Each structure stands twice: as structure tokens, then as C-alpha cells.
């Protein structure tokens, strides 16, 4: 292979030669230049004006090697900044790649899938432009096989990643018709036995579930929540992270969607998620819990039945401070929407000491959340003639001191609520 380490000048000489095979050699040399991880000369290749020549090569049926080489080079040009991807798009590459998707050579169609994914990954605009050119139909036609296992592993992984990029990005979100067109194949991929396919499919579902309740409902109608929970229980963290993200997105919708999550058995997995060694898994699991303790009282009772209140107490006691803030949110929602029996159970699980210990943080929001939770618990106690007991409890663990110190805190509502508590339950 004497196509190693050409100069941009030599490649330009070869591509302008009007000799199909000299052009093929120059295009392979360009591909190898662009395939180096140490600063590929993308900008230099663009300034040479080579993108139109590559795009024209994309359509040379009688020379599949130059098709593959130009597709690879343009894929690696589109893998760069938004301006480089834009240079690829302006050359007319989208329709050429969509036409290549029907190539009878598997590696060329795979490279076209790769390039289209790189393009759509730039953002909403290029995503929707790829959709408008009619990519979804051929992309999904490539997956129209009885058993996904017959497809090549890398082929299927690239197809899944591209389809996931077609579901990515918001403001705007993907077209509803496109999501309806993709979701069946996406579910079939979500039921695949390959870990990377599963991770990309869960990321796609997490993208689709990040939005209004209508999108969440589109996703939930397809009965993917049970599979999402099964994957939530997986050992491969790359699969668990997107599955937890998707469950947390779904529980932000209506209480019926949250209830479908609960029915699928998600809570049973949360004892592990809330003690996960990954800080972000813990944080997102606590964030998901906060969106469940905000729901109905029967759902709070489901949380309690699964014995997850001790795990929230633990997270509040020792965890990354952001996880602790999400836990404070969950506790405040619990107390605001829960019964008196449930608030009493929360206090019995040992919430008061770790809740007080967080009133010395420098985050003003967590102070407000904790004070709101304390006010709710004190209301629940008033409903029992137990305010004296709870005040004694908060005093014996050093909480009264922090509450008093919060009267000089700069923020307004902070000292307002703290002074209210001081004057109302401590006299």
C-alpha cells in the first residue's frame, strides 16, 4: 500500500487527474490521512476543495472502491466541528449517501449509514434535513429481516447508532411521524442480545422520552417499559445508564405512566441503583425517586412497601452532594404529597439527623427544600399533637442550632421560613 502519507498537494494532483484510478488512489490516501487520530487534516482537505469531488465519487456505480473510500473520507470530515459537517452537507452529500444506502455492497451501505449518523448528530437542523431527504425508509429497510442476528455485528451497531442520532436533540424534537416510523424497529433492537445495540437503543428511547407527556406516551404505548426495567437490572453499566435515564424521563410524565413503570417492577431494582458505585447512577436513581414520591399516595406507599425509604435515608446520610440534593427533593415531595402515617414512617426510618446535617451546606436551594420538608413533617405532627416530640428530636441532634443560624442567611425566603419555624415550634 503506497497510499500512506501523501501531501494534500499530491492528493489534489491525483483527484484532478481525470483518471478514475489515479483518483481512487488519491481518495484512498485522503481517507488514510483523515483516519489518523492525531489531528486529521480536515480543514486542509476542505480548503483544497475536495468535498465536491468526493460527493461526485459517491455516485460512481461502476467503481465501488472509490465509493467506499470517498464515503469513509466524508464520514471523517463530517465527524468534526459543525462547520466541517456543514461543509460536507453543502457539497450535496446527504442525497448521495441516501442513494448509497441501497448499495449491494454491505460495507458501502454501512459507511453511508455512518456518514448519515455523523451528519444527523450535528444537531436538530441537519437531523431533520436528513429525515426530509428520505433516509428513514431505506435505513429501516436495511433492518427488515426476520432475525436481527443474521446481520453483521458492526453493521447492526452502526445502524442502531445512526437511528439513535435521528431520535436525538430537542428544540426542535424529531418529527412525530418520524418517531412513529422508527419506534417499532427501535423496540425490536431494544430486544436484541448485543450490549452495544442495547445501549444505543436505550439512549434513543431516552431521547424520545425527554419531552412532553405526548412523547412519553408514544413510547410507553409500545410496551417497552418492562424491557427498560429488565435492562435497568443489567450488569453492563453502559446499558444501565441509558435505561435509568429513560425510566427517569418516563416518571416525569403523568401518574399513569409512573404507575406503568412501577407495575413493571422498577422499584425492585432501586436498592442496587441507590447504592451503585457510580455517582451518576446514584444521582439519577435518586432523581427518579423524587419524581415518584411526587406522585399519588398509593405510589408513595409502593415506594415504602419496597423498603426504599431506608435507602433514601442512606443517600441523604452519605453520598455525592448532588445525589443528596436530589434526595432532599424526593423527601420534600414525599412529605408534601404523603399521608400522616407515611410521614411518621419516614421520621421513624431516621430522616431527621441526615436532614439536619444538610442545613450547613452552601447551596441556598437545598436549604429551602429541607425547610419545606421540615414544615410538612411538622404539619403532620401537629395533626397528632406531637410537635413537642419532633421539636425535642430536632433539638437533640443539633438541628435547632442550624435553624436559628439560618435566620441571618442572606436569602429572603430562607430566613423567612427559618424564623417562622423558630417562632412556631420553639418557644
Amino acid at each position: 500500500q503506497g497510499t500512506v502519507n501523501w501531501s494534500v498537494e499530491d492528493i489534489v494532483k491525483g483527484i484532478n487527474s481525470n483518471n478514475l484510478e489515479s483518483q481512487l488512489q488519491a481518495t484512498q490516501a485522503a481517507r488514510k490521512l483523515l483516519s489518523r487520530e492525531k489531528q486529521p487534516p480536515i480543514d486542509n482537505i476542505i480548503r483544497a476543495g475536495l468535498i465536491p469531488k468526493f460527493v461526485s465519487f459517491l455516485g460512481k456505480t461502476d467503481c465501488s472502491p472509490i465509493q467506499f473510500e470517498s464515503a469513509w473520507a466524508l464520514t471523517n470530515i463530517a465527524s468534526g466541528t459543525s462547520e466541517q459537517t456543514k461543509a460536507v452537507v453543502d457539497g450535496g452529500a446527504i442525497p448521495a449517501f441516501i442513494s448509497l444506502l441501497a448499495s449491494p455492497h454491505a460495507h458501502i451501505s454501512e459507511q453511508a449509514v455512518w456518514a448519515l449518523g455523523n451528519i444527523a448528530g450535528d444537531g436538530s437542523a441537519f437531523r431533520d434535513l436528513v429525515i426530509k431527504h428520505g433516509a428513514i425508509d431505506p435505513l429501516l429497510a436495511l433492518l427488515a429481516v426476520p432475525d436481527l442476528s443474521t446481520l453483521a455485528c458492526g453493521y447492526l451497531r452502526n445502524l442502531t447508532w445512526t437511528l439513535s442520532n435521528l431520535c436525538r436533540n430537542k428544540n426542535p424534537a424529531p418529527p412525530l411521524d418520524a418517531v412513529e416510523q422508527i419506534l417499532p424497529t427501535l423496540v425490536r433492537l431494544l430486544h436484541h442480545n448485543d450490549p452495544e445495540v442495547l445501549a444505543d437503543s436505550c439512549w434513543a428511547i431516552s431521547y424520545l422520552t425527554d419531552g412532553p407527556n405526548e412523547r412519553i406516551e408514544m413510547v410507553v404505548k409500545k410496551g417497552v417499559v418492562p424491557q427498560l426495567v429488565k435492562l435497568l437490572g443489567a450488569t453492563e453499566l453502559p446499558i444501565v445508564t441509558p435505561a435509568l435515564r429513560a425510566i427517569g424521563n418516563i416518571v416525569t410524565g403523568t401518574d399513569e405512566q409512573t404507575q406503568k413503570v412501577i407495575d413493571a417492577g422498577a422499584l425492585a431494582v432501586f436498592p442496587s441503583l441507590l447504592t451503585n458505585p457510580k455517582t451518576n447512577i446514584q444521582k439519577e436513581a435518586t432523581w427518579t425517586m423524587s419524581n415518584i414520591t411526587a406522585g399519588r399516595q398509593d405510589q408513595i406507599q409502593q415506594v415504602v412497601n419496597h423498603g426504599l425509604v431506608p435507602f433514601l435515608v442512606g443517600v441523604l446520610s452519605k453520598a455525592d452532594f448532588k445525589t443528596q440534593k436530589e434526595a432532599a427533593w424526593a423527601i420534600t415531595n414525599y412529605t408534601s404529597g404523603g399521608t400522616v402515617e407515611q410521614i411518621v414512617y419516614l421520621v421513624h426510618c431516621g430522616i431527621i439527623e441526615p436532614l439536619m446535617n444538610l442545613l450547613s451546606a452552601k447551596d441556598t436551594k437545598i436549604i429551602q427544600v429541607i425547610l419545606d420538608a421540615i414544615s410538612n413533617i411538622f404539619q403532620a405532627a401537629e395533626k397528632l399533637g406531637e410537635t413537642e416530640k419532633l421539636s425535642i428530636m430536632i433539638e437533640e441532634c443539633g438541628g435547632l442550632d442550624k435553624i436559628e443560624a439560618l435566620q441571618r442567611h442572606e436569602n429572603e425566603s430562607v430566613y423567612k421560613a427559618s424564623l417562622n419555624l423558630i417562632e412556631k415550634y420553639f418557644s
Partner: peptide, 7 residues
Amino acid sequence: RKRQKLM
């Protein structure tokens, strides 16, 4: 977002 193809 994007993925470069390496040799």
C-alpha cells in the same frame, strides 16, 4: 454526537 472511523 459524532464518531470518526479509524484504520
